[PDB]
């Protein structure tokens, strides 16, 4: 005993000149699986984008009406669901967990978790995925569910709130003949409890034609057949091309059209025959209370967001913990890239002396060290697009906010970055022989952690801007190399030209590099030229030890300073003056590294706003 | 009027303990499309790997026999074809071009090109791809042929020599119901001219069961049904589970097995019933001259390789030219990465002076310049795996040699690297103000070209070793950073520790870097300390210009040399002695850069030998 809903769309015209829809009529009751057949550019993903109100208002001339209140974009978020054309699921999540996260995101917080689990277990029985309810989804290399049980979990995510109107953009694409029948057979099970189901389909099997109660064929818009599948034999015989038996009728009715548009003819002879056939077959409670009559039976489980910003920030945290705990070779390869570089940098630069050449090796250690923190954060660019192609699916239903997505993904990566910062610091502080003691080691861990934080935020920012993972990881390798060229190591700040001293201050490597130099070269006790080391690698004065002091006493002719055999002519403060590291403190250079991390998480949030407009 | 061939395999047992095949019997005449049905781990890609002789000899107990001479792995290279399970095609090639390259690779050179084009045009009519014969194949973003016309080109490549025995590993996987019927319908057209076709199939449609004349069901080996599809209703009724009508017969016979293996029961009740059914149904010219009788009709178009090493080196050249000419945004992104870095490096290091700090900026220019040649060659790692996943397909047929593949792919990239070497050299020689004149510019182009050649060969070598494009481009970014740390720029050769002075000499960046330093700092006229530059950035001697000459005359107290106000205390030969660039000439450092390129193309060739063993 369902509640009857009648989705009637009378005339549709969408022009982008180039028209895409032209006077498509339709009428679909509950219990029916109206199918929109067509071509690969016919615009059948545009027709159901116009019934789901997913195009601009005012650019769609005509009415899409339910039984009652005109069906504008206020009811088509509580009672509607639009299933897109992919299976964008997290692969380390089981089928019961994937539908329970969608239940915790979109079902209201007034429901208990025992009632949200009762919705998931009733949905797993409905989709026919009870045998794979505890099997993970799986990508190409993790041995999960099949390709046609990955579609009913994709369908099951969008119907977790139990809609009474269901749009699907090609739910049988990519599947074989025996599992595309299983998808429409559970859509028939959905559309017998009261749902209106409107789907696109390229080439249906003969088994899925007694499930579909209505068909619509499109030809660059321009509906050429619109009726029951049983009336499809007695439509083209009147047109001029009768169909033979022992042949799929929708197969013959589709390849006939793709040779009929011609060059001198056209589909116009077939368009005007469609309105001929619809004219001759006619000789044969409010909406808001009908929606509430569905909830009395129970046909609608579900404010803009069902959860507060602090509830959906612990659910997105629990997803990202579970998706990385079950995928541990991601922080096994990023961990053994900072340990391998940490072991290499510690043994090459092992216990650097206070020579003038051992000072330039500190500048070369700290430039290679602080660039590892930015290059190992670029390895996470594969699983940053994968988490935001699923985010763009779940933003259409308002499962969570964009603020709760950016904040909960800055949170889950941070215990990973604390472990990467201690692994790189205990390998390279005591082995390179860095200065500071223990309070210089704690700052060394803090500036590695801020460089992991500023580097993860930049690669996160460079994932709302790049489409591809190979274009993005070529661009981020090139840009971080320019951040290293402008860090002040290859060319100093007072030597960079004036048309280029703006990307020096925009360098992400500069402020970690300038903070470890004055963590290391800030000590009045350590010395790098002890009086005799003036004339050591000079172009003169290659003496044994004698008569160098007479050269040092000869310096007192011109200045008056009494230079002895050990007088400490170069401290660490003179190294920083040679390199130009004088403008900011090491704590101010730590704030800019933390501040550049917060900047690129805000700019990532602003690129999710403009990506929502697309 | 075909020539009858009867492929009879009587008993097969393959053990890897873990038995994978157990006593599979079969008998397939010409004109029949024997199908091997099963599960997702049943080992039905192992049964046709044992009929194609693609497993180890002696590990397969039993006979796979044709009508005659026992069918060992000498006839299964001329008369056989094994179609694997993918569509590994170059996407910028048209359908007529993709089959003409396979005709130029595998048809004998005794045939004219007019007879090889007559084979391709007869094959395009046979596969039913005449409408898409001049359409390109296309990847996900280049708008090519469909997914089920990409399979008949994949099938059409392997049957270009017109085999009389055809094995296919799942030729209907990934397709929909209407194009998997089109694949078996052209296989029915192939297997009416005289071919024996043996294919694996997961779930066949009801239309493809009157084309298949024989079926074999497997259950972890262990053939459970082996007969005609019409005898499939009258097999399970005798077993104990009769099938209802209006139901696909192979659909019910497959999900019955996946619930029958149980935990306390097993498929053993179904295995021993298969030999029951085969016993009760039986109550109802040499091979070498039968093969030559097929060529009399014309059923075999096709030495180990059909072409010499110089003919298939111009065909692989013509493929790689056509695949890159029609994909020009590959050398549009690698070109605008050496021009953008070339413009950045030329304007930052614009006209470097002869200061002591402008010397260290030359070492920083040349380290960043010579590392661009290795990092921009790592962008080609996507299309290096794609060209060698297609190479592993075409090595199984001996379409070309491994030597002709390595040599023709070192050849086609070289005019691309000459243009990248002139684009980086004319941007950065005259703008940075490098020394040498015009004979120092020609060496500058040669060492950029050798660094592009040594860097392309290393990334080519690191594509037979890595499976994945993201693992490989993380590894090659990390290793080339270690080639740069050991180049002698970050730490000099005489300062690198003795447990690490073997990766310094294995550094790929070291020899380009050491060759441009003694192309630049090898001039007895240029000078970097002109007498007064002793005490200009010293910790003392900060005079105006006066009384420094008394300090310089004071050097003659202990040395005896008359140091004047302009005496050239540091030439370019003293810069190279400070950096340790003394062991090799710039022409010897150019030979090691060219020699490291030839080393990594030999090691790439040796990794294709060991990849053939897998
Ligand atoms: N989201 C979109 N934004 C912009 N243009 C679109 C969008 N979707 C489709 N189009 C365009 O609309 C036209 C009609 O195609 P469409 O009806 O979407 O095809 P199909 O029936 O294959 O799904 C195409 O030219 C396509 O480029
Ligand atoms: N080329 C191969 N090398 C090694 N093991 C293989 C190979 N192909 C299959 N196997 C193994 O053989 C077993 C049987 O699977 P198989 O018969 O290939 O399956 P399917 O019927 O799905 O093609 C599996 O455990 C698989 O790991
Ligand atoms: O171009 V459409 O594939 O979405 O049929
Ligand atoms: O594991 V097998 O897919 O090759 O059916």
PDB file of N, CA and C in Angstrom, chain B residues 368-428:
ATOM      1  N   UNK B 368      71.367  23.805 -10.409  1.00  0.00           N
ATOM      2  CA  UNK B 368      69.946  23.850 -10.714  1.00  0.00           C
ATOM      3  C   UNK B 368      69.687  23.667 -12.201  1.00  0.00           C
ATOM      4  N   UNK B 369      70.599  24.142 -13.054  1.00  0.00           N
ATOM      5  CA  UNK B 369      70.440  23.952 -14.492  1.00  0.00           C
ATOM      6  C   UNK B 369      70.570  22.486 -14.867  1.00  0.00           C
ATOM      7  N   UNK B 370      71.665  21.844 -14.461  1.00  0.00           N
ATOM      8  CA  UNK B 370      71.930  20.461 -14.840  1.00  0.00           C
ATOM      9  C   UNK B 370      71.001  19.462 -14.171  1.00  0.00           C
ATOM     10  N   UNK B 371      70.242  19.860 -13.154  1.00  0.00           N
ATOM     11  CA  UNK B 371      69.220  19.005 -12.577  1.00  0.00           C
ATOM     12  C   UNK B 371      67.871  19.151 -13.261  1.00  0.00           C
ATOM     13  N   UNK B 372      67.658  20.239 -14.005  1.00  0.00           N
ATOM     14  CA  UNK B 372      66.451  20.377 -14.814  1.00  0.00           C
ATOM     15  C   UNK B 372      66.432  19.347 -15.931  1.00  0.00           C
ATOM     16  N   UNK B 373      67.606  19.012 -16.464  1.00  0.00           N
ATOM     17  CA  UNK B 373      67.706  18.047 -17.551  1.00  0.00           C
ATOM     18  C   UNK B 373      67.368  16.637 -17.100  1.00  0.00           C
ATOM     19  N   UNK B 374      67.467  16.365 -15.809  1.00  0.00           N
ATOM     20  CA  UNK B 374      67.128  15.055 -15.288  1.00  0.00           C
ATOM     21  C   UNK B 374      65.708  14.998 -14.760  1.00  0.00           C
ATOM     22  N   UNK B 375      65.188  16.114 -14.263  1.00  0.00           N
ATOM     23  CA  UNK B 375      63.837  16.159 -13.726  1.00  0.00           C
ATOM     24  C   UNK B 375      62.779  16.336 -14.802  1.00  0.00           C
ATOM     25  N   UNK B 376      63.112  16.986 -15.916  1.00  0.00           N
ATOM     26  CA  UNK B 376      62.168  17.089 -17.019  1.00  0.00           C
ATOM     27  C   UNK B 376      62.136  15.838 -17.879  1.00  0.00           C
ATOM     28  N   UNK B 377      63.139  14.974 -17.773  1.00  0.00           N
ATOM     29  CA  UNK B 377      63.105  13.672 -18.418  1.00  0.00           C
ATOM     30  C   UNK B 377      62.308  12.652 -17.626  1.00  0.00           C
ATOM     31  N   UNK B 378      61.956  12.965 -16.386  1.00  0.00           N
ATOM     32  CA  UNK B 378      61.117  12.109 -15.566  1.00  0.00           C
ATOM     33  C   UNK B 378      59.636  12.345 -15.810  1.00  0.00           C
ATOM     34  N   UNK B 379      59.290  13.363 -16.598  1.00  0.00           N
ATOM     35  CA  UNK B 379      57.909  13.592 -16.994  1.00  0.00           C
ATOM     36  C   UNK B 379      57.448  12.598 -18.047  1.00  0.00           C
ATOM     37  N   UNK B 380      58.381  11.954 -18.746  1.00  0.00           N
ATOM     38  CA  UNK B 380      58.070  10.984 -19.784  1.00  0.00           C
ATOM     39  C   UNK B 380      57.825   9.586 -19.241  1.00  0.00           C
ATOM     40  N   UNK B 381      57.848   9.406 -17.928  1.00  0.00           N
ATOM     41  CA  UNK B 381      57.593   8.120 -17.285  1.00  0.00           C
ATOM     42  C   UNK B 381      56.162   7.592 -17.452  1.00  0.00           C
ATOM     43  N   UNK B 382      55.082   8.448 -17.546  1.00  0.00           N
ATOM     44  CA  UNK B 382      53.798   7.920 -18.034  1.00  0.00           C
ATOM     45  C   UNK B 382      53.865   7.253 -19.396  1.00  0.00           C
ATOM     46  N   UNK B 383      54.305   7.961 -20.435  1.00  0.00           N
ATOM     47  CA  UNK B 383      54.479   7.287 -21.715  1.00  0.00           C
ATOM     48  C   UNK B 383      55.927   6.784 -21.814  1.00  0.00           C
ATOM     49  N   UNK B 384      56.232   5.813 -20.961  1.00  0.00           N
ATOM     50  CA  UNK B 384      57.295   4.817 -21.055  1.00  0.00           C
ATOM     51  C   UNK B 384      56.819   3.459 -20.580  1.00  0.00           C
ATOM     52  N   UNK B 385      55.882   3.428 -19.633  1.00  0.00           N
ATOM     53  CA  UNK B 385      55.194   2.222 -19.210  1.00  0.00           C
ATOM     54  C   UNK B 385      54.106   1.860 -20.205  1.00  0.00           C
ATOM     55  N   UNK B 386      53.455   2.879 -20.771  1.00  0.00           N
ATOM     56  CA  UNK B 386      52.404   2.663 -21.757  1.00  0.00           C
ATOM     57  C   UNK B 386      52.969   2.079 -23.045  1.00  0.00           C
ATOM     58  N   UNK B 387      54.189   2.464 -23.413  1.00  0.00           N
ATOM     59  CA  UNK B 387      54.823   1.888 -24.589  1.00  0.00           C
ATOM     60  C   UNK B 387      55.423   0.514 -24.332  1.00  0.00           C
ATOM     61  N   UNK B 388      55.634   0.132 -23.074  1.00  0.00           N
ATOM     62  CA  UNK B 388      56.194  -1.174 -22.757  1.00  0.00           C
ATOM     63  C   UNK B 388      55.170  -2.144 -22.188  1.00  0.00           C
ATOM     64  N   UNK B 389      53.948  -1.693 -21.901  1.00  0.00           N
ATOM     65  CA  UNK B 389      52.857  -2.636 -21.705  1.00  0.00           C
ATOM     66  C   UNK B 389      52.287  -3.107 -23.030  1.00  0.00           C
ATOM     67  N   UNK B 390      52.446  -2.306 -24.083  1.00  0.00           N
ATOM     68  CA  UNK B 390      52.096  -2.724 -25.433  1.00  0.00           C
ATOM     69  C   UNK B 390      53.228  -3.550 -26.034  1.00  0.00           C
ATOM     70  N   UNK B 391      54.471  -3.279 -25.624  1.00  0.00           N
ATOM     71  CA  UNK B 391      55.612  -4.058 -26.095  1.00  0.00           C
ATOM     72  C   UNK B 391      55.553  -5.491 -25.584  1.00  0.00           C
ATOM     73  N   UNK B 392      55.116  -5.684 -24.338  1.00  0.00           N
ATOM     74  CA  UNK B 392      54.986  -7.026 -23.785  1.00  0.00           C
ATOM     75  C   UNK B 392      53.853  -7.810 -24.429  1.00  0.00           C
ATOM     76  N   UNK B 393      52.858  -7.122 -24.992  1.00  0.00           N
ATOM     77  CA  UNK B 393      51.850  -7.791 -25.804  1.00  0.00           C
ATOM     78  C   UNK B 393      52.447  -8.279 -27.116  1.00  0.00           C
ATOM     79  N   UNK B 394      53.203  -7.418 -27.788  1.00  0.00           N
ATOM     80  CA  UNK B 394      53.736  -7.689 -29.114  1.00  0.00           C
ATOM     81  C   UNK B 394      55.043  -8.470 -29.097  1.00  0.00           C
ATOM     82  N   UNK B 395      55.616  -8.740 -27.925  1.00  0.00           N
ATOM     83  CA  UNK B 395      56.779  -9.617 -27.854  1.00  0.00           C
ATOM     84  C   UNK B 395      56.370 -11.084 -27.873  1.00  0.00           C
ATOM     85  N   UNK B 396      55.139 -11.384 -27.453  1.00  0.00           N
ATOM     86  CA  UNK B 396      54.652 -12.757 -27.433  1.00  0.00           C
ATOM     87  C   UNK B 396      54.447 -13.327 -28.829  1.00  0.00           C
ATOM     88  N   UNK B 397      54.278 -12.474 -29.834  1.00  0.00           N
ATOM     89  CA  UNK B 397      54.111 -12.897 -31.214  1.00  0.00           C
ATOM     90  C   UNK B 397      55.386 -12.771 -32.028  1.00  0.00           C
ATOM     91  N   UNK B 398      56.468 -12.291 -31.408  1.00  0.00           N
ATOM     92  CA  UNK B 398      57.723 -11.914 -32.060  1.00  0.00           C
ATOM     93  C   UNK B 398      57.470 -10.945 -33.213  1.00  0.00           C
ATOM     94  N   UNK B 399      56.730  -9.881 -32.895  1.00  0.00           N
ATOM     95  CA  UNK B 399      56.488  -8.827 -33.873  1.00  0.00           C
ATOM     96  C   UNK B 399      57.771  -8.072 -34.183  1.00  0.00           C
ATOM     97  N   UNK B 400      58.591  -7.833 -33.166  1.00  0.00           N
ATOM     98  CA  UNK B 400      59.891  -7.208 -33.338  1.00  0.00           C
ATOM     99  C   UNK B 400      60.788  -7.667 -32.200  1.00  0.00           C
ATOM    100  N   UNK B 401      62.076  -7.381 -32.338  1.00  0.00           N
ATOM    101  CA  UNK B 401      63.047  -7.782 -31.337  1.00  0.00           C
ATOM    102  C   UNK B 401      63.044  -6.808 -30.166  1.00  0.00           C
ATOM    103  N   UNK B 402      63.663  -7.233 -29.064  1.00  0.00           N
ATOM    104  CA  UNK B 402      63.866  -6.318 -27.948  1.00  0.00           C
ATOM    105  C   UNK B 402      64.975  -5.323 -28.248  1.00  0.00           C
ATOM    106  N   UNK B 403      65.940  -5.708 -29.083  1.00  0.00           N
ATOM    107  CA  UNK B 403      66.986  -4.777 -29.484  1.00  0.00           C
ATOM    108  C   UNK B 403      66.433  -3.691 -30.393  1.00  0.00           C
ATOM    109  N   UNK B 404      65.516  -4.053 -31.293  1.00  0.00           N
ATOM    110  CA  UNK B 404      64.896  -3.074 -32.177  1.00  0.00           C
ATOM    111  C   UNK B 404      63.911  -2.171 -31.452  1.00  0.00           C
ATOM    112  N   UNK B 405      63.465  -2.549 -30.257  1.00  0.00           N
ATOM    113  CA  UNK B 405      62.580  -1.684 -29.488  1.00  0.00           C
ATOM    114  C   UNK B 405      63.369  -0.671 -28.671  1.00  0.00           C
ATOM    115  N   UNK B 406      64.488  -1.098 -28.085  1.00  0.00           N
ATOM    116  CA  UNK B 406      65.321  -0.204 -27.291  1.00  0.00           C
ATOM    117  C   UNK B 406      66.050   0.789 -28.190  1.00  0.00           C
ATOM    118  N   UNK B 407      66.480   0.343 -29.369  1.00  0.00           N
ATOM    119  CA  UNK B 407      67.206   1.222 -30.275  1.00  0.00           C
ATOM    120  C   UNK B 407      66.291   2.227 -30.956  1.00  0.00           C
ATOM    121  N   UNK B 408      65.079   1.822 -31.327  1.00  0.00           N
ATOM    122  CA  UNK B 408      64.167   2.739 -31.997  1.00  0.00           C
ATOM    123  C   UNK B 408      63.485   3.702 -31.044  1.00  0.00           C
ATOM    124  N   UNK B 409      63.563   3.467 -29.739  1.00  0.00           N
ATOM    125  CA  UNK B 409      63.029   4.401 -28.765  1.00  0.00           C
ATOM    126  C   UNK B 409      64.107   5.284 -28.166  1.00  0.00           C
ATOM    127  N   UNK B 410      65.377   4.944 -28.368  1.00  0.00           N
ATOM    128  CA  UNK B 410      66.450   5.900 -28.170  1.00  0.00           C
ATOM    129  C   UNK B 410      66.586   6.843 -29.351  1.00  0.00           C
ATOM    130  N   UNK B 411      66.072   6.451 -30.512  1.00  0.00           N
ATOM    131  CA  UNK B 411      66.202   7.235 -31.734  1.00  0.00           C
ATOM    132  C   UNK B 411      65.121   8.305 -31.830  1.00  0.00           C
ATOM    133  N   UNK B 412      63.868   7.966 -31.511  1.00  0.00           N
ATOM    134  CA  UNK B 412      62.768   8.904 -31.720  1.00  0.00           C
ATOM    135  C   UNK B 412      62.780  10.024 -30.689  1.00  0.00           C
ATOM    136  N   UNK B 413      63.310   9.771 -29.495  1.00  0.00           N
ATOM    137  CA  UNK B 413      63.362  10.817 -28.489  1.00  0.00           C
ATOM    138  C   UNK B 413      64.492  11.802 -28.724  1.00  0.00           C
ATOM    139  N   UNK B 414      65.487  11.442 -29.522  1.00  0.00           N
ATOM    140  CA  UNK B 414      66.662  12.287 -29.701  1.00  0.00           C
ATOM    141  C   UNK B 414      66.429  13.602 -30.457  1.00  0.00           C
ATOM    142  N   UNK B 415      65.605  13.694 -31.521  1.00  0.00           N
ATOM    143  CA  UNK B 415      65.289  15.037 -32.044  1.00  0.00           C
ATOM    144  C   UNK B 415      64.445  15.872 -31.103  1.00  0.00           C
ATOM    145  N   UNK B 416      63.677  15.243 -30.216  1.00  0.00           N
ATOM    146  CA  UNK B 416      63.008  15.980 -29.154  1.00  0.00           C
ATOM    147  C   UNK B 416      64.001  16.540 -28.149  1.00  0.00           C
ATOM    148  N   UNK B 417      65.085  15.811 -27.871  1.00  0.00           N
ATOM    149  CA  UNK B 417      66.077  16.264 -26.904  1.00  0.00           C
ATOM    150  C   UNK B 417      67.037  17.293 -27.477  1.00  0.00           C
ATOM    151  N   UNK B 418      67.221  17.327 -28.799  1.00  0.00           N
ATOM    152  CA  UNK B 418      68.044  18.367 -29.407  1.00  0.00           C
ATOM    153  C   UNK B 418      67.326  19.709 -29.342  1.00  0.00           C
ATOM    154  N   UNK B 419      66.002  19.709 -29.489  1.00  0.00           N
ATOM    155  CA  UNK B 419      65.247  20.952 -29.400  1.00  0.00           C
ATOM    156  C   UNK B 419      65.135  21.441 -27.961  1.00  0.00           C
ATOM    157  N   UNK B 420      65.030  20.520 -27.002  1.00  0.00           N
ATOM    158  CA  UNK B 420      65.050  20.895 -25.592  1.00  0.00           C
ATOM    159  C   UNK B 420      66.416  21.386 -25.145  1.00  0.00           C
ATOM    160  N   UNK B 421      67.483  20.960 -25.814  1.00  0.00           N
ATOM    161  CA  UNK B 421      68.831  21.373 -25.459  1.00  0.00           C
ATOM    162  C   UNK B 421      69.193  22.726 -26.032  1.00  0.00           C
ATOM    163  N   UNK B 422      68.636  23.080 -27.184  1.00  0.00           N
ATOM    164  CA  UNK B 422      68.838  24.407 -27.739  1.00  0.00           C
ATOM    165  C   UNK B 422      67.926  25.436 -27.098  1.00  0.00           C
ATOM    166  N   UNK B 423      66.753  25.021 -26.621  1.00  0.00           N
ATOM    167  CA  UNK B 423      65.862  25.946 -25.935  1.00  0.00           C
ATOM    168  C   UNK B 423      66.399  26.333 -24.567  1.00  0.00           C
ATOM    169  N   UNK B 424      67.061  25.407 -23.874  1.00  0.00           N
ATOM    170  CA  UNK B 424      67.627  25.728 -22.571  1.00  0.00           C
ATOM    171  C   UNK B 424      68.963  26.445 -22.689  1.00  0.00           C
ATOM    172  N   UNK B 425      69.688  26.244 -23.786  1.00  0.00           N
ATOM    173  CA  UNK B 425      71.011  26.842 -23.894  1.00  0.00           C
ATOM    174  C   UNK B 425      70.970  28.269 -24.414  1.00  0.00           C
ATOM    175  N   UNK B 426      70.102  28.584 -25.378  1.00  0.00           N
ATOM    176  CA  UNK B 426      70.055  29.964 -25.853  1.00  0.00           C
ATOM    177  C   UNK B 426      69.341  30.872 -24.865  1.00  0.00           C
ATOM    178  N   UNK B 427      68.571  30.307 -23.934  1.00  0.00           N
ATOM    179  CA  UNK B 427      67.936  31.127 -22.913  1.00  0.00           C
ATOM    180  C   UNK B 427      68.924  31.493 -21.813  1.00  0.00           C
ATOM    181  N   UNK B 428      69.843  30.585 -21.479  1.00  0.00           N
ATOM    182  CA  UNK B 428      70.660  30.725 -20.284  1.00  0.00           C
ATOM    183  C   UNK B 428      72.144  30.951 -20.537  1.00  0.00           C
TER     184      UNK B 428
END
